[PDB]
């Protein structure tokens, strides 16, 4: 698993948030991307940086990400620390996981 797509649509038309971990870093863009039906122009934001838990929230204005990496879905408890606050003013109704 490398990343996620978040937006109202995943077929251009409306801006989508693309978060991808590739080789050495994480690339985050909010372009009006044209996606494939099996993934694996107009941009307002761009940024470039085992059990892995993540929390994704979409508050007004920001898209919040929390995460935790622990050694090993086993029973147990831990809390996730905040990772990044992305100032992305978009509507998100659907998302896709990229493998």
């Amino acid at each position: 698993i490398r990343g996620w797509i978040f937006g109202t649509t995943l077929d251009s038309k409306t801006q989508s948030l693309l978060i991808v971990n590739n080789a050495t870093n994480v690339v985050i863009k909010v372009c009006e991307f044209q996606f494939c039906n099996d993934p694996f122009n107009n941009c307002t934001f761009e940024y470039v940086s085992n059990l892995r838990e993540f929390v994704f929230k979409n508050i007004d204005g920001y898209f919040k990400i929390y995460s935790k990496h622990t050694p090993i879905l086993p029973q147990g408890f831990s809390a996730l620390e905040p990772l990044v606050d992305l100032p992305i003013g978009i509507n998100i109704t659907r998302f896709q996981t990229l493998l």
Binding site: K13, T14, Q15, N42, T44, D60, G61, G89, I90, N91
Partner: protein, 50 residues
């Protein structure tokens, strides 16, 4: 007249705080689909400030 600046006049709903909507999809005011075409009860959503 400087008609370069646009504002949205037609929208199906209100915005959330700090939401930025730049869609240019034709607004349907009536009961029938516009399919991207302006005309009776179909409008380009943005109006210029002259």
């Amino acid at each position: 007249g400087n008609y370069n600046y646009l504002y949205r006049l037609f929208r199906k709903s209100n915005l959330k705080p700090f939401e930025r909507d730049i869609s240019t999809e034709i607004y349907q005011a009536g009961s029938t689909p516009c399919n991207g075409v302006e005309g009776f009860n179909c409008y380009f959503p943005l109006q210029s400030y002259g």
